[PDB]
Structure formats: structure tokens, C-alpha cells
Structure 1
């Protein structure tokens, strides 16, 4: 009956892993992995926060482009991502990635063969 809400899809490890498998089919699993990394940051102890923020950059923002802003301005990027500013930036990107996952990818996941596995067959 009632459609699972995308908020609950990402809150439940069993649901979210199935949605991640669907994103892998689209070769866009880095979108949900980045969302999961920022969310893990929101619920992490502060002794791990700066190293996690650094691993987020090293896992999702180090794609080497031909016009290499990442290499030419490495120090300059890190300094404008230093403290609460960097955490606030990663939060805003997570918010934008969330809307893209919700509006562009979640509707086709509901009609995929994976949404069935999230439904309880009543006995």
C-alpha cells in the first residue's frame, strides 16, 4: 500500500543498501556513498571529525580533471574547507545530493525489481 518514504529508505540499513545496489546499476553509487559519509559525520565523535572530513574529500572530490582545479589549488581548497565552514559546505552538498537521489533516482527504484524486497508479504 503506502509508499516507503525516501527518508526511511536512507534511515534503514536494509532499505538503503538495496537502494545503493540500484545506484550501482546506474554507475552512480558514489552519490549514496557520499551522502552516507556526510551523515556518518553528523553522528561522529569530534576526535574523528577532522580525519573524516579529510577522507570525504579524498574519497569523492579527488577526481582528476583535465582542467585540474584540484591539483592547481589544493592548498587553497583546503583552507576554504577548514572548519565549521567545511562541514557546512559538505552539509549543503549532501542536501543537494539528497534531493537529486529523491527526485531523479528514487522513483525508478520503486518500479525496479529491488523495491519488492523491501515489502513484507503478509501471511
Structure 2
């Protein structure tokens, strides 16, 4: 049994979990997680463009990432440079808890995961 952290940190495993989440139109939770992980690792030169793209991908084009008004106001401040990017790491932790508690256990009993374990028989 792959641990939740093992699925999220291997990019191939995480993409297959994205495929599983696309079946209920919730791939954006996995996409947001990976964009937030990239943001916190990125060269500081990249942050303005990556924050703009984050808002486009996960708050404009998708409304799957549901946040309390206080967090959304912190994002609205971050768009115009009046806050840092830590709000995206907070929302990442909230998304991670949803994925781990609500979706990961059902992913483990999917066709997609059964195939993954045949592909990765070294486990």
C-alpha cells in the first residue's frame, strides 16, 4: 500500500491520482496541490507570474478550490502584492487533508491503482 505522501510526491503517481479525480471533475485539487508545491520551491524571480497563473487556473477557470472569505480576501491582497504567498501553502494543506481523508482511500481500491501496482511491482 503506497502512503498518501508517496502518491503525491512521485509525479507519475500524482498524475494517475489526477486521472482518478478527473472522473468526479475534481482534478483541480491535485493540480492546485502541484502548483502550490512548485510556488513554494520556485526562484523568487518567478513568483509574480506563478501567482497570476495560480489565480487563473484555480480561482478563475476552476471554482473547485472552495476557501473561506478571509482566505479569499488574503488571495485578493496577494494578487496586488500587499501579501506574501503563504496563503497558498495554507490552502495546499487544507486540500491535502481533503485528498488524504476523502479521496485517497477510494483511489487505493480503483482500477487505476491496481494497474499502478502491476506497473511498479518493485513495491
Q: Do these two structures clear the TM 0.5 threshold for a shared fold by scoring above it? A: yes
Aligned residues of 2:51 and 2:79 also touching (Cα < 8 A): no
Q: Which has the higher contact order (CA 8 A, sep 6+)?
A: 1
- Structure 1: tracts of 5 or more residues without a match: 66-75
**Secondary structure at the residue paired with 2:102?**
helix
The alignment covers a number of residue pairs equal to 111
Q: Matches of residues 1-123 of structure 1 in structure 2 within 5 Å? A: 3-62=1-60, 78-83=76-81, 85-119=83-117, 120-121=120-121
Higher helix share: 2
Aligned CA-pair RMSD: 2.6
- Structure 2: tracts of 5 or more residues without a match: 64-73
Q: Compare CA radii of gyration and give the structure with the larger one.
A: 1
> Residues 5 and 79 from structure 1, CA distance in 2 versus in 1: closer, same or farther, beyond 3 angstroms?
same
TM-score using structure 2 length: 0.78
- Cα offset, 1:59, TM superposition: 1.2
**Secondary structure at the residue paired with 2:55?**
helix
